[PDB]
Design a protein around this ligand. Structure first.
Ligand SMILES: Nc1ncnc2c1ncn2[C@@H]1O[C@H](COP(=O)(O)OP(=O)(O)O)[C@@H](O)[C@H]1O
Ligand SMILES: N#Cc1c[nH]c2ncccc12
Ligand SMILES: [Mg+2]
Lengths: 338, 359
């Protein structure tokens, strides 16, 4: 019942500036007790149009059961007053419970997908719909986790998960070292980092933007793992490893990071496969980039190496949630060239 | 439209590979067979695009420029259908067919500027331009790709079977089976340099590197149409040179344009890198719209055809062209070409229900 009702609302996207300028507990409580059920209900309605053999997997049934229970947990606060202190404190406890309940959503959904794909025939249309759904499902989770964690961290130098002066280069170095450690453990060697930076907006000044560092770290860690693996495997018959070159550029509207390796590249024919849905790190990393209207692209030189590029909005006011909405256009989405 | 247009528009174009075009021009060279194919295929391709011309905005179709293009295509279609009664064994028919292709080629010589002129007028008289009108962008990709394909096929026949039009001795028609990619890069760069020097009295240098992953240390060759490759590189070099000079105009020297040519198992990839300040990601898509240009409309820049037309040439044989920019620093332009001639297959538009739906 509650699912159908709240699915009629459209999600309300927030800017990073809103999350900053705002971060009153009563206001956050009133907003989130409405907004989180809306987002949960919207994606629940989309789960119901997936193939029947996929929805009936124990994994998708778990996700659906968790999301429905969290929606009901949150809807129960609509009968409470924002002035009710126990309700404010219980709301924090409930968000923590919901976050704990959703801790394993990503690997559980992935398990359902893998089980369905391995067991059943998947026509090309269905395969494209699964890509469409998974992008939207995982973006939806990124967004609910973002909002809930903001309220938890603030009300239970950063404003919640947002660093208003994110040291981009420092995140790049941290993500690279994380990948380096795993590369050394597995291969006994790893490429070095050759980093340069260009502050076009503020010449010679350090590069800072408003951003969620954990998101940026996730994107860079995944790209570095892939670039290090490609370098080591492509150059296994070599004494030394070519470095991974990174340039960080702050323009007027955009913050760009380009990661270059000489790991042999990938044929253009199959480059898109890397973004197909464990092999989920790259498509999810692109979701993180697009979440606040950024983007993540790969362009490879098969036989030589690969360039990975992250785009982020440089202005917090333009960093607005990109949210999926279950509406006529979505349902409809589910030969002019030879 | 004439009955011949309606009839032949019902057929789908038949795409060929460069391997076929090569074979049909050398070992499998049979003038009769090429005649039999082209006298049907060229009407089909002309009729298919003529149907899409009819559904353009009435204010655009009625420009003298578009009406002329339509009149040219119809006459060429009629010229070709007149050969449907003749026998391939008729040597006079084969000779007349060559003469007719030369006539059609000369007639279509000014199609691209004529169509572009029409778009310009339709923009001044109605404020409608491909930048904001997705239907016009959609049509122009298909119209220009269609012309690329018909010019390709007719030129192949002319340059192989005509008495006086022999083309390049080392080529099979317009196809170089051993295209020296790096040599075309250098030639295109020099062409762009000469034009850049006339607008700015300076031009960046070329820093070229090459990697033959498929045949290490060997010169990089693929089967390709060098004129098409030259056009793409020339347009991308013009863009990189303008961006570089104007962005570094207060600097004692110019950073070079860096080019890497890589031959892999399936791909030939050319990346052109500049330090010309880059482009905001927001407007990246706008860049590939016909007529979009940050320069005033006039030539070095301003007509806004470089990127979309160059992308058409790349995609014509299943390649691609992308642009990735670091706003505030520079831009990487990347060309992808198929390394195998058997996979270099014509990418052709077809007029059908799907096409009609897009409009
Ligand atoms: N390498 C580059 N660096 C910066 N901007 C570029 C680059 N290449 C293209 N552009 C932008 O894309 C626009 C469209 O380019 P193009 O289609 O070649 O037409 P034109 O060169 O006539 O403008 C240009 O006006 C320019 O603003
Ligand atoms: N992300 C990423 C990658 C960066 N380099 C790569 N080389 C081969 C395959 C994937 C990648
Ligand atoms: Mg240009």
């Amino acid at each position: 019942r509650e699912v159908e009702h709240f699915s009629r609302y459209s999600p309300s996207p927030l800017s990073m500036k809103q999350l900053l300028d705002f971060g009153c507990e009563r206001t956050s409580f009133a907003f989130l007790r409405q907004e989180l059920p809306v987002r949960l209900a919207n994606i629940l309605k989309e789960i119901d149009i997936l193939p029947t053999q996929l929805v009936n997997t124990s994994s998708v049934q778990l996700v659906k059961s968790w999301y429905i229970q969290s929606l009901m947990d949150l809807v129960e606060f609509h009968e409470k007053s924002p002035d009710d202190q126990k309700a404010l404190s219980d709301f924090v406890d409930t968000l923590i419970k919901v976050r704990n309940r959703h801790h394993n959503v990503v690997p559980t959904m992935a398990q359902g997908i893998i089980e369905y794909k391995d067991a059943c025939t998947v026509d090309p249309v269905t395969n494209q719909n699964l890509q469409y759904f998974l992008d939207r499902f995982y973006m939806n989770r990124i967004s609910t986790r973002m909002l809930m964690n903001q309220h938890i961290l603030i009300f239970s130098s950063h404003i919640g998960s947002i660093d208003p002066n994110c040291d981009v280069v420092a995140v790049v170095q941290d993500a690279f070292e994380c990948s380096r450690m795993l590369c050394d453990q597995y291969y006994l060697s790893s490429p070095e980092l050759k980093l340069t930076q260009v502050n076009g907006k503020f010449p010679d000044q350090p590069i800072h933007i408003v951003y969620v560092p954990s998101h940026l770290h996730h994107m860079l860690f995944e790209l570095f793992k892939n670039a290090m693996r490609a370098t080591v495997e492509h150059q296994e018959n070599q004494p030394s490893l070519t470095p991974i070159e990174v340039i960080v550029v702050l323009g007027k509207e955009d913050l760009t990071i380009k990661i270059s390796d000489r790991g042999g590249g990938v044929p253009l024919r199959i480059i898109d496969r890397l973004f197909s849905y464990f092999g989920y790190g790259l498509p999810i990393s692109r979701l993180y980039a697009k979440y606040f209207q950024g983007d993540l692209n790969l362009y490879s030189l098969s036989g030589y190496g690969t360039d990975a590029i992250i785009y982020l909005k440089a202005l917090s006011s333009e960093s607005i949630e990109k949210l999926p909405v279950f509406n006529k256009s979505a349902f409809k989405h589910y030969d002019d060239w030879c």
